[PDB]
Each structure stands twice: as structure tokens, then as C-alpha cells.
Amino acid sequence: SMSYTWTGALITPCAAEESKLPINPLSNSLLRHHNMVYATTSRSASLRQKKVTFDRLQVLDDHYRDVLKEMKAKASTVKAKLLSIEEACKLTPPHSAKSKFGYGAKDVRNLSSRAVNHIRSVWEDLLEDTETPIDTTIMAKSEVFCVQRKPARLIVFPDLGVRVCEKMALYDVVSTLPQAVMGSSYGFQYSPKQRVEFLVNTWKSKKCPMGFSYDTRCFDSTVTESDIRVEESIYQCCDLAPEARQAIRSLTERLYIGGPLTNSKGQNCGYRRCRASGVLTTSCGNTLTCYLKATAACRAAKLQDCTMLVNGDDLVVICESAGTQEDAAALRAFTEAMTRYSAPPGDPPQPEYDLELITSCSSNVSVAHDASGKRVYYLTRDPTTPLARAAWETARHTPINSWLGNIIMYAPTLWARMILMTHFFSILLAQEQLGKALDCQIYGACYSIEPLDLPQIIERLHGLSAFTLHSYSPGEINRVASCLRKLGVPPLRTWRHRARSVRAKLLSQGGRAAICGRYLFNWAVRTKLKLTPIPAASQLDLSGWFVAGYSGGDIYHSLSRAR
Ligand SMILES: Cc1cc2c(-c3ccc[nH]c3=O)c(C(=O)NS(=O)(=O)C3CC3)n(Cc3cc(F)ccc3F)c2cc1F
What we know:
The protein is α+β, with helices and mostly antiparallel strands. It has two domains: about 350 residues, no CATH class; about 200 residues, no CATH class. It contains 21 helices and 14 strands. The strands form five sheets. It has a five-stranded mixed β-sheet with strand order 1-8-7-3-5. A three-stranded antiparallel β-sheet has the order 6-10-9, with helices on both faces. A two-stranded antiparallel sheet has the order 2-4. Helix 15 crosses helix 16 and helix 16 crosses helix 19. The protein is globular and about 70 Å long. It starts with a strand and ends in a 24-residue tail after the last helix. The site of ligand HI3 has 18 residues, from helix 8, helix 15 and strand 13. It is a single-pass type IV membrane protein. It is found in: Host cytoplasm; Host endoplasmic reticulum membrane. It catalyses: RNA(n) + a ribonucleoside 5'-triphosphate = RNA(n+1) + diphosphate.
């Protein structure tokens, strides 16, 4: 069946759309080639519609059926809880899209009578009606990139009331079921340090390792109605409250398998028969589907001792080599099996024999040295997108600060320490905003974090070595330096100079600012300050940070104030 059908109505914006990076003094201090930075808009939506619309042909076999039964036997151990309305309301981001029914995210979070009444009505409707397709809005996503232009990605999501109900029925399922089913292969249970440890230990565990990343083209569009019903068959193995069982059944038939598309103007846009990108099950469902197809494809390909690491549609496989020619042929057999399963490749996978050459979750393993000269493995990535987005976020107030998420997740990297920390601490200190909480995203969930709490966050995630790495690889240094020339970012010497300045100012303030000066900027001086465990680090409640993926799932993970 076609992933989408269209009526001809356009994918419309709801307000004015900015596509060019503004010429602003603060962003220009970071990145001077402003014309290279752009944001996607609804103006390119028709190009994306063409790419995501195609017929799916899916052929299932015994390997697929065998793996599915194995997955369901593991799902059968799970007991999932129905969330109360209050619990589901607290998981709603403060800036989540308002309902079309007269209330918004602040009303949901405040448990306003109108919001609660409407959520109760939507819940009862899911329990009573098993078939009426649920309306969804389709919008073009506004995302920033560096040239060499991508068309806008499309986001499809139901109304706020339905999103609260999805949490009630499925938040516990999507949070706990993936690790129960996939075990160590489930990527979202790992912090970046745990992920690098898992990749390095897996790589070194093979007698002669071979690894590859597998890029499915337009994954959400490749997801069939059969895949979404198979995903529900796994959720149904949980012990569930009867209302949760009916809600999951109704949500599957009325929303997850497909439904009508409406634009921002209220016009009928078309019909979807594939994965919606903006529902609570997007991450979990994609992860399960990708794991199932890949596990079965490994068996069809006769790949030896496969270890998968899956995050949604992002897949990396590490296995035992059977020799270069045999590996090349088995990888072609894997691709053929994935294609039969309706997961054809974007670019053909390539066998890799060096762990540092593999890109998974847009990241690669690299090596640096700690204060003792000991080798420390860590995850890095090409810094082009992070820098382009940091420049955008400097010129415009954006709802999500990718720069803050990048400092947290890529804290050990040369580029996050020398450029992102220096730039934003310099600006925030000048604005007396170091203690102002900002929103960022970790594995798709929204968190409100104060920049002054970064040292203890980084220590907990990455260890104290994140503040002592030096002797970065020549390849990594070259990639960063080349990116700076390309984007017109000042060279690393300028960053060191700016860091010494903000470091002095932070130290002069005492308190949490001085802890930022000491730990975050010790790299900038020859006269190193002594770095001991931060007392606040052991007290941090990082429950919920690295449990599951929630991208597109409308999840907020910071504390709700009492009432
Ligand atoms: C080192 C490291 C950092 C991240 C971050 C991450 C970086 C910066 C800020 N905040 C973050 O969370 C994410 C991530 O953005 N997750 S997500 O669910 O929104 C997914 C995009 C939909 N991931 C998983 C992931 C990354 C892809 F680039 C692609 C697919 C994926 F699953 C990571 C894996 C890692 F090894």
C-alpha cells in the first residue's frame, strides 16, 4: 500500500517562517559564514512529500517469524502500569502544542477543569470506539543545517488530549518493554560513556570483528500496517490493566496504523498508512521493528555472532568476520533480506574493520588521554550541525537549546569544551543568566537545566576525565579545525583566549560559577586546579535520563511544582 496519499491541499505554516540565519553580533562571534546556515520551512514540504510517498512491498519469512516469537517470549515478562491523569499531565512539556478544543499545555500541567474534562472524554472514547480514525496534523519541521539543501522533515501528531491518553496507556510500556525484549541491544538504556563502553567491549569481544551501520531510507515510510500490528502484538504480551489493553487496541487501529492528515488551516491533506513521527510509540515501535527486521536479516545472511545496537531506526551491527569476500557477500545478503522486510537501504552498508570508522547515532568512537596519560574512549561527531544550530540559538530564542544538550552529551569532545562551553558561558555570564534554567533534549525527552549545574551533570555522565582529556587524535583535531574554516568559526587559539577570560570571571564570582570555572575550563590554563568529586554529583537524580527513547513522543522529564 502507499505510505501516503495526498488530496492536493498544501502543508501550511501556522506563522511566519525564518529560513536564513540572522546577521547578529553574538552569533557572528561564533560563526561568520551566516549564508551557509539555513532552517528548513514548509516551502520545501512538496520535495519531502515526493521522497516519503511510495508503495511498500513486504515479504515475511521463517527467520522473521522465529525472531518475533523470541521477542514476544521476552515481552511476556513485563507488567505495565496505567498512569493516572495527573501523572500523564506532569509528563506534558509546558510548550506542547495546544489542543484544538480550547485548552493548552499550561492548562494540562495545572490540571485545569477544562483540560481534565476533555482528557477524560478522549480516554472514554478510546475505550468505547475501536475504529473511528483519529485526526492528525501534518506540519513541516523547522530544523537548522549547514549547506552541502535538505527539504523539511514532516511531523504528524494527534491532538493534545489524545497525547495525554497515549501516556496513560503506554508510557510505562514504551519505557520498560524495549530493554526487556532487546536486552543489551537497546541503545537508549546507555549514557554516552556506557554506550562507548558497550561498543568497545563488544568490538574487543570478537576474535576478528567486523561492524557496519545500516541506514534505512525514510524509515517511517517503510513501516507497514503489518509492522504496526506486529508491534501491538508485542505490547499485548505485557500484563496490562483492561482499560490499557483496550486503549492500546483502539490507538493501534485508530491512530498508529494510519489515519487522515489535516494541515494547520484545517484542510484535509491526505491519508497516512505508515509510522506517524509524532506519537508516543514512534521511538519504541521503530526500535522494535528495526531490531526484529535486522535480527531476522542477520540469520538470513548467515552473519556470525551478531551483536546489534539499536536506537529507533539507527542501527549498528558488530559481528565475527568470515573474511573480507565472505563479509562483503553476507552484507549484500543482509541488505537483500532487509529490503524484502520493507527496510531498503539509503546508501549501501559497508563492512568496517576499525571501530573508529563506524558512525552510529551520528557519532564515532575516538580516543584521548586523561591527566595520567591513560587512554580514554569517548563518543564524538562531526561538529558542523551542532555549530550551525548553536549559531541559530544565539541569534534567536528557540524552544529547545541544542547547544545545551550537545554540551551534556558531547562534554568530553574538543569542540564542546573549547567552543560551545566558552561561547555560551561568555554570553550567559554577561547577561547574568548562568542560573536561568533552559530547555534541552536528551534521547527525545525535554529537560529544564541550569547551565551552572553542568559540572556535576558532566561528572555523573562522563566521569572527572571529561575535564582532563588532552592529546586528542590528529583525525579528530583535523575534522574540528576544517569545520571551523568551512563555517568561518574563529580558530581554536581564539577559543582558548576567550575561555581564559570567562574562566577568570567565573572564578571571581565564587559559588557554582567558580565550580564551572574550575572544572569546565581547567583545559584553558597551564596552572591546573585540583579536580575532586563534586559533592552535588552523587546527589543528582538522573532517573529517567537514560532509560528509553522518546523522540516525537511529547515527553517532559523535569520535576512538577506542587499545588
Ligand atoms: C553521544 C550520543 C548523543 C546522542 C543524542 C543527543 C545528542 C545531543 C543532545 N541530545 C541527545 O539526545 C541522541 C539523540 O538525539 N537521541 S533522539 O532520541 O533525540 C534521536 C534523534 C532522534 N542520541 C541517539 C541518536 C542520535 C542520532 F544522531 C540519531 C539517532 C539516535 F537515536 C545519541 C547517541 C549518542 F551516542
